[PDB]
Design an enzyme around this catalytic site. Sequence first.
Site, PDB file in Angstrom:
ATOM      1  N   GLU A  12       0.849  -1.191   0.000  1.00  0.00           N
ATOM      2  CA  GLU A  12       0.000   0.000   0.000  1.00  0.00           C
ATOM      3  C   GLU A  12       0.899   1.261   0.000  1.00  0.00           C
ATOM      4  OE1 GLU A  12      -1.232  -1.483   3.958  1.00  0.00           O
ATOM      5  OE2 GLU A  12      -3.235  -1.912   3.156  1.00  0.00           O
ATOM      6  N   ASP A  68       3.214   3.131   4.075  1.00  0.00           N
ATOM      7  CA  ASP A  68       3.943   4.281   4.613  1.00  0.00           C
ATOM      8  C   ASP A  68       3.359   4.659   5.975  1.00  0.00           C
ATOM      9  OD1 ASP A  68       4.044   5.849   1.310  1.00  0.00           O
ATOM     10  OD2 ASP A  68       5.463   4.448   2.223  1.00  0.00           O
ATOM     11  N   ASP A  70       2.704   7.623   7.127  1.00  0.00           N
ATOM     12  CA  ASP A  70       1.804   8.776   6.992  1.00  0.00           C
ATOM     13  C   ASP A  70       0.314   8.384   6.989  1.00  0.00           C
ATOM     14  OD1 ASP A  70       3.032   9.227   3.558  1.00  0.00           O
ATOM     15  OD2 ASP A  70       1.411   7.906   4.239  1.00  0.00           O
ATOM     16  N   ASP A  72      -1.975   8.672   4.614  1.00  0.00           N
ATOM     17  CA  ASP A  72      -2.334   7.960   3.379  1.00  0.00           C
ATOM     18  C   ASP A  72      -2.123   6.445   3.506  1.00  0.00           C
ATOM     19  OD1 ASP A  72      -0.923  10.772   1.726  1.00  0.00           O
ATOM     20  OD2 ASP A  72      -3.074  10.303   1.695  1.00  0.00           O
TER      21      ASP A  72
END
Lengths: 190, 190
Positions: A12, A68, A70, A72
């Site tokens: 992802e 990641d 973050d 997102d």
Amino acid sequence: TDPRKSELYVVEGDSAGMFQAILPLRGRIDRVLKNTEVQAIITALGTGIHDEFDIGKLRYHKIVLMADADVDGQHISTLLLTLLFRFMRPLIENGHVFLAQPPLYKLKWQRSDPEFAYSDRERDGLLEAGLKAGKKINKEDGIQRYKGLGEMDAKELWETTMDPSVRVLRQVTLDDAAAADELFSILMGE
Amino acid sequence: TDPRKSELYVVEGDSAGMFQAILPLRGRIDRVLKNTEVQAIITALGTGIHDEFDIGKLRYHKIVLMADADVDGQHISTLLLTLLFRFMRPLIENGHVFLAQPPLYKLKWQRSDPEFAYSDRERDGLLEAGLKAGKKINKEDGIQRYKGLGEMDAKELWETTMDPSVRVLRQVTLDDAAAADELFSILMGE
């Protein structure tokens, strides 16, 4: 190739990179189940969903989610852990679900192999050990802080997140998946 | 992660190992379409099959088939190329289908990086070039002849068959797929 010797990596999302299968997941629960990437992941697992779930048909010993750090990356991991918690619960309960911890830093030693740190503590430790050993590093650009998985070259991504002797995996517990499910419900209501 | 920057590797079969997705295929045409591993590959491609085939929904720019040179590896590649020729023909016609050529030899140089040969001619060439350069090799065990993909370590499998700057790919033409389809029909009749 055997299910016991097989792993499925779900990479992802929009900033992406023992048999190791790999499937992407880029980034309303009924609409998500119709998504092609989601359908490919569910199909590859081979168990079926909800009342049709059959643990005996599980094609992969380990299911590894890689995203990641973050918002997102979190959003996609939240979505997939919710789908697993709601329609494929024994995969989590039986300890098949894991989160891959991507490296945070790359230590670019001058005349030796680069080293990878998974925390600020490990970065400091490796830097001190290297300099003590006689290794050289550039003080201005020798330590690369990763912002996403897409910044890594394919070879180093495998070395740090997919190599079983090197990788840092965290087992997804039922409580972890329940917290992802609650997070999904909060964000959908927003 | 984008379809244009995405590739799907199909690793075959019972002796197995830019976004690179990976799916296995271990190893009556209607019964094959019901197989979980086959269903996962078809679903990941995202186009649908037969009259429902939509080229615009293709999730992968390249579809790479990787199998052993033996009859077991050939059988699986024959099966998958037949499924693609019969139900997903434009994938072949539009040049998306490729066969990965796995290395045949590993040249274990004494004090340098190992080299990989994809033919007897390349093996002889690399051996001569290495010895001329001053590189050392053991005459008894320095040249490993691979019998299958499963003999390779995961890192070297990626380096030799998946790295775009190193790998040896052969484009599957419509004639190649038609020959695989004929071979499938002959073997089914036997």
